[PDB]
């Protein structure tokens with residue numbers, strides 16, 4: 001008892017970090033180690049050309065299908081975050097519409113080869129050239145830059161998990177009813193994140209460089225929405241008849 005009281009503080013941070021870590025491990029589509037062992041499996045030049053030969057609307061549908069799969073896994077992660085399921089359906093929805101893509105881009109770092117500038121996509125590792133038919137060179141370059149920048153921090157699986165839970169439970173998304181409860185939850189997650197960050201590299205204070213990325217993610221997800229609305233103005237029926245329903249609902 002007396003010993004239990006002396007540990008209660010940090011024990012609680014460790015407990016929450018382990019909870020979130022586990023939720024992350026069990027809701028990622030692929031194992032980190034799996035992804036790292038096949039970075040050499042890049043598309044061959046012939047396959048690259050084929051993707052480049054596809055029509056704009058065709059490449060967009062494919063990417064939306066692939067992104068929707070990753071989002072499905074992020075929704076499973078959210079469900080397991082303590083507090084998320086206690087919120088009103090309305091706040092649950094607002095946090096997912098705003099954060100599900102941000103968590104995807106965070107998870108992208110586990111499936112990104114920084115030295116060669118390539119991302120795991122449709123079975124192989126893809127250079128930015130694979131996405132040329134989208135007609136979004138700037139948005140694509142921003143995505144890869146983000147991948148490179150998060151990789152350069154060599155975040156551990158537990159670090160990625162707590163950072164995912166952090167930008168997901170943000171109390172500043174517009175239209176939230178329970179700002180105070182969500183805020184108290186993010187604060188805990190953040191103390192837990194700092195706890196695990198210092199466990200590995202009290203060498204710096206990267207928590208700030210990480211929290212700095214938060215603003216970059218919002219701009220990245222903001223551009224996605226802009227590009228998508230621009231695409232939907234030209235291909236309204238492609239979006240309506242061939243885009244995945246969950247992607248439509250979210251974006």
Ligand SMILES: CC(C)CCC[C@@H](C)[C@H]1CC[C@H]2[C@@H]3CC=C4C[C@@H](OS(=O)(=O)O)CC[C@]4(C)[C@H]3CC[C@]12C
Pocket residue numbers: 027028029030031060063064066067070073104105107108110111119120121131143224227
């Ligand atoms: C306009 C929009 C549709 C274009 C987006 C094109 C690229 C940026 C997308 C398409 C498909 C996306 C991947 C789909 C699937 C995954 C698996 C996911 O793996 S997991 O193990 O972490 O769950 C990590 C993100 C990752 C690598 C995504 C990165 C981002 C990704 C390459």
